[PDB]
């Protein structure tokens, strides 16, 4: 398309000093670059050297995210070199810190910004996006960014970082990814007073106009790019998150990772546990600390797993209890019970606990899952009560970051003599016990699911994503534990091999999508594995050398 | 020319969030920016707030040079806002530290790279340069980067930084500035071992090819851009610096800042000292610690300044003495004598000095100038020796960085008890003696000279720069001091006013060029002040809004 | 700058099928062109073949002017191949015919259009012109297009065609040429009723606004491109033409070809004649048929020639009489005498003619010059009266086109036994007389002057063009007649060698410009010939091949 300085200024084309001598000469770059040819390998090492001479995580974020705006293929190469250590940077927890000071660290814009001031003109904006074949859209209003609450347009970092992991893990063409931020104001007074805030100076609009903007946004996106365009909602308010999932679910090809992706990884760990504890599902009793979107999201998907294994809906629900901030979810309590909690709000026992430890002793659960985000509430005695009740208790401490976790690997494994099966939201290191026996805990990271699922949905031209897709993703993830990894005490495969794990998920989800008539991409491929591997985006530089030859 | 995302990837047009609502809508940026209209001020305050979060100078270099590549108008606004503090960052000393690791911090390339491997195809390379009306070239081989020696292609940071100051100070259009690095190899072993070295992995070619390559380079630039294109040689090795300056002085529009710019700023101080103490020029004698590039440069220019005032050639030279690392330069000594030094190699006194303190006592100088870059060799006893020999002694400690300076301001002013006239290369804060008097010493930075001179040479379409230009530039620098500032012991205007000072220098040089028939820009302007002040480049954002207006139906 | 289809769509870069194999491969053109390499020679022949299979002049114009918008270098090559025959097409007379039907034949726009509706916004328009270093501007209001009168914006063809001859003859870089049309309405009712008219539907504005538009236009041009920018006025109303020349002459670097260029070629022929008739200038009496801009233009320049040869102003004026539509210009006549005619309005004789033949017998002129544009008014007996009075009478029939000429070569040479010295505005073929003696008449074409002058003015950064520049151009033109050409009866060199003639004029005018301190381009060149030849624009294709080589 273009030659000269424009090639170097365009991230998609810019190879940097990896432009070969001929490329330089033939594309009019000779002299604009230093007289040295590099490879993507040399360029990558240079990054790792600079990254080592940096302590601050926020400095690492700003550096690496700058590389995206200079050389795209280098950027995604660098993530793929060591994804485990850099995923903390490009996404959580660091992305939170970046999102807090997002107006300070701003350098170059990265996504698409739709305001409530642009009401009725969303189509004009969408059309300004240079890329023509968008497949994956990630959107946020910024109201519920991680644990940091409302951050307005500073939330844009989340879409951006999310889509980095789409490309990095799954192989979704970056040029077909679109991060979107919906600015309708913000209730965060700190930001309104900040003169470097990048959003609108007004409180959140919660009128009809907000709903209308989302409708128009959804329409505008699909008008330009198609109805099969994948649209993921991220870090919306809990109220908005659920009701928008409901009203668009069967209309637009949309999912919510915070609900559905979270449920999937939760379940995938439970299913990993059942390769150890083979107890009939009839026996499993499950107790959630917290009754948030995370709880309800996970709860529903468990019920659906239980249903596919024999149990009814009514019965499977009665095997799930929830203990939130006001106490145990029971019928006829003064504390509020919302519509989504009603199915898990159960007939009260004789003794009605006022403590979580009290509940564990009364209800005799085989599994406790922590999603309160309210610190260390799985007390040492809670851990013990579970070890007395179950021979191998399943304890899931999912809250993030580490400081909000309900308990620690250390705290879990040692207080149950290394019997329990543990998994966490935040990364804990190998625990060592006094008998010289190693236990390597797994991490319940959402990145196990959404990339693979997203690739499959896109590759199959799927138009709606049913809850049973995430159920199939769960089974798919769990089916990649080797025996060794289970012996070591992992309920998830290593994050190190996320790329491979993401693909195999995409494959197994593609098969399911065709088998249940949710794929509209025909002709149907016979070998789904080949079909997926072939279409994943590679970070290797392509030649940009024009073809010169003699005429014989 | 362009619309959409290209306007934001092009730093000459990119206003960032300073794009108005009208501009965003009409240019198709609406939605690509956050919904927040800023101004150049807010953007600037953001930069200032973030600069404080950084502690390392090198972090700051990387952050600020980054802005040149995102937003050019914003970049030069940031420099002009706080020029005094950020000039250390953008250029010396921090550019030295950056130049050392230039390949380790490389993100985007900034200039034009001509290797020896491109011999015969140099015009090809010149023609790849996007800009069509280049007026100012700064070129480096990389052989003698500051006091760091041979950094080779790492030396590119020097031209890049220096042209920032052309623009920042004098208002020379950035799009007409071309930084160039001639790459002929490097003698530095560490770099030849480095897998991130950005140059050719070979020793410096010192053969005939090197000379040919510089010839070809000079021809190629002036072919494309014209013969009056200003070509400034920077940080070449001594041998080459002088010989090329001689070879091209009369053929192209060229100068060397390390020689001629240094001389101008040196002389500017000496003349300002002369204003304080009306010492007859016959009753002056100059002692240089060091007899290299800086010494020889300042020497040759001083001679002219004396000759101008009445002295002859030989007369003025005999008032200038040089003491190098082998000792005092005297006729028929043991250590060798370069031909440029020969004029300042006199017949030995009766007692040949073996140290510098000796020389001060034997020769009884009025002024010592330190350009050896070898630490605190103006020992306390030397400052005292001068303090007793002269009523008002002039002491110039020009060596950089601070650690290689011959003495501090504190050391100079206390051991002379206020009676000293002091200047240095490195910045020394205010010196407050016990008795109550405060002395603010002048910094003898080259940046006083080269911006103003370059601007003048360019606006007058001058084809050659004789040494009298720098002489005339020196007087122009000296003449901007207030009497109050002379009473404060300043021999140089504040760096806070480098802009006002650079323009005023450019004006006076313009008058000189026209008055002495060295200008070729006719018709000749009458008011030279208005001419210069009108052609300076501004950092204020231009509107990119196309004109919408109504036609009678 | 650019590669691919854009190179082929850009006239300045487009070489057509003359793109070499390597160029095609290296610039991404391989496949977009037919598999055949041509030269500019092959491409040129193709043009000449097509031009031969066309009768209509208007078809030839549309074809060749299309080539300018496809391949610029080919276009100017083709003019330089046979300039003599094609100059009739690109300019007069055909350009007149094209200008009449300009809205019909419109295909692609060619110049810059400034309307009175764009009052106060002329700078915006000027800035829309893509070219950055304009040197030669030709502008028209369209009020007095050739003989066709007011044609409004259809007059744009004139600037365009004029500037074709700038490039074709002189070598003025086409990219530095700017044709401008000032639309202020038109009095031509035929055009106002035409629904394909390309100008404004209103009568000519003759208020202050017109004058103001011209001021702003002049300012805007010079603001962007400089005060030394050459601005030529063409085919303005006679009133406007003179007064605009006067008020801007010493302000903007401006000339008018219809006045000054016309005067120059007139004089150059008179000076050619004086190499035959060596009579002292004191004896020369001159009589103009018509007292138009052409008459007055020529008259003044003659006076200035006479002055440089010894005569005073008052005396030199008395040697010039004028006979216009109302009769002989005499003091105290009922017919109007304008300010410019006053110097040539003389003390009445005893007998005051009412016929032009009557005047020739009374006043005894040695030279008659026809610029009435009113047909054959040099009656056969006029021709004879001149032959009886003078041994070699100088008869100049300058009116155009041929039908408006005052007499013919045939009519002139035979009615004076082949004694007279004749020149015409329109081309007449070699006359043959009954004694087997050939007389080849010259043409008083303005193209002899303005290209050479224009090149010199531009190359010398001249800021004002004095009348004595055109006087020097005249002497320069005449100094290129060989003796043979004078023997044959030519008062001008062949149009065939206009390119060479234009350059030599530019050289001699450059020398004069430096010698009289009108050049601001220093350093001054020592050899003016080399200086000019070096800087003329060539039509040869340049290589567009990027430099590829090995690294030794
Ligand atoms: N660069 C190329 O050579 C190129 C590029 C695109 C398509 N094609 C050709 O077109 C055929 C059909 O391609 P298609 O795109 O219409 O359908 P497809 O069968 O190749 O892909 C199905 C769907 O998945 C999307 N998709 C595929 N890979 C993706 C990725 N890495 N990231 C995001 N979205 C991705 C496509 O846009 C499409 O909507 C291909 O089989 C190939 O022959 C070639
Ligand atoms: N590991 C993962 O993949 C993953 C994914 C999503 C969310 N999470 C984590 O889940 C946690 C909850 O997120 P959420 O979106 O459900 O938030 P939420 O506000 O919707 O849920 C919080 C719930 O905890 C309850 N609670 C608060 N303090 C309590 C206390 N002291 N005792 C008992 N109950 C208490 C609240 O009443 C509420 O029911 C967070 O810490 C978040 O980091 C983890
Ligand atoms: N302040 C300014 O504007 C400015 C401008 C240019 C140069 N300088 C300074 O000038 C200094 C020298 O630069 P240069 O290019 O002339 O270097 P150079 O290598 O050309 O000259 C060094 C000279 O010092 C002599 N020398 C070295 N050690 C000595 C010692 N111990 N005692 C006596 N003489 C000794 C050497 O023999 C030689 O003659 C540097 O420190 C540099 O910072 C300052
Ligand atoms: N061209 C037009 O001509 C007039 C001026 O002509 P000109 O462009 O030759 O300039 P000029 O005649 O005003 O100045 C003469 C020279 O100065 C240069 N120059 C002016 N400002 C400069 C700057 N800020 N940085 C670097 N070089 C600078 C020019 O390129 C030229 O070489 C203006 O009207 C302009 O738009
Ligand atoms: N393509 C090239 O290589 C190229 C192009 C332009 C200039 N140059 C270099 O710049 C030097 C100075 O060029 P300059 O233009 O400033 O001055 P110049 O001395 O070459 O020309 C003087 C003036 O005439 C104009 N001019 C020259 N040739 C012309 C033409 N054919 N048509 C119209 N206008 C014409 C110029 O624009 C200028 O205003 C040249 O001597 C050359 O070294 C090179
Ligand atoms: N050969 C050239 O280079 C050249 C250049 C310019 C104009 N011309 C020709 O000159 C002629 C006049 O052009 P102009 O611009 O001076 O027009 P104009 O209207 O200014 O001049 C016409 C003059 O002829 C007079 N006239 C008209 N009919 C007459 C008659 N029957 N008897 C006597 N006088 C009569 C008018 O009164 C007026 O004085 C045109 O035919 C034009 O083609 C030739
Ligand atoms: C309301 O309190 C919350 C709720 C959810 C979160 C999230 C997480 O705890 C995640 O781990 C999380 C997440 C982390 C990693 C990941 O793949 C890299 C995907 C999601 C989120 O998106 C969250 O919103 C944080 C605080
Ligand atoms: C040989 O040792 C040297 C020689 C010269 C130098 C230079 C300086 O000491 C400068 O101050 C210097 C300089 C510094 C600032 C400036 O304007 C900001 C211009 C020149 C140079 O270019 C040098 O080369 C340093 C060490
Ligand atoms: C008013 O009647 C007129 C006046 C002038 C003309 C012109 C000519 O007769 C030209 O020859 C003429 C011209 C012709 C050729 C040329 O070089 C090719 C330059 C001018 C004009 O520009 C005229 O305006 C025509 C009719
Ligand atoms: Mg989230
Ligand atoms: Mg230097
Ligand atoms: Mg005309």
Numbering used by the authors:
A (entry chain A), C (entry chain A): 22 to 573
B (entry chain B): 22 to 574
Paper text:
Malic enzyme 2 (ME2) is a mitochondrial enzyme that catalyzes the conversion of malate to pyruvate and has been proposed as a therapeutic target. Malic enzyme 2 (ME2) is one of three known isoforms of malic enzyme (ME1, ME2, and ME3), and one of two mitochondrial isoforms (ME2 and ME3). A major function of the malic enzymes is to convert malate to pyruvate, serving as a metabolic shunt to regulate TCA cycle activity under fluctuating external stresses. Due to this flexible and comprehensive role, ME2 has increasingly become of interest in cancer as a potential therapeutic target.
We solved the structure of ME2/NAD+/NPD-389 and ME2/NAD+ (holoenzyme) at 2.45 Å and 1.89 Å, respectively. Both structures display the canonical malic enzyme tetrameric assembly, with NAD+ located within each active site cavity and buried within the tetramer interface. The ME2/NPD-389 tetramer assembly is produced by crystallographic symmetry from the dimeric crystal structure. The inhibitor is localized within each active site adjacent to an NAD+ molecule. In each of the two unique active sites, NPD-389 coordinates Mg2+ through its central 2,5-dihydroxyl benzoquinone ring, displaying metal-oxygen distances of 2.0 Å. NPD-389 binding is competitive with respect to L-malate, with both molecules sharing the same site and metal coordination, which is consistent with the literature and our own enzyme kinetics and inhibition data. The 4-OMe-substituted phenyl groups of the symmetrical molecule project either into a non-polar pocket within the protein interior or out into the solvent space. Within the non-polar pocket, a small section of the protein centered on Thr113 moves to avoid a clash, and a potential weak hydrogen bond is formed between the O-Me group and Asn466. Compared to L-malate binding, the Tyr112 residue, purportedly facilitating proton transfer in catalysis, rotates away from the active site and forms π–π ring-stacking interactions with the buried 4-OMe-substituted phenyl group of NPD-389. The solvent-exposed 4-OMe-substituted phenyl also forms potential π interactions with the Leu 167 backbone oxygen and the side chain of Arg 165.
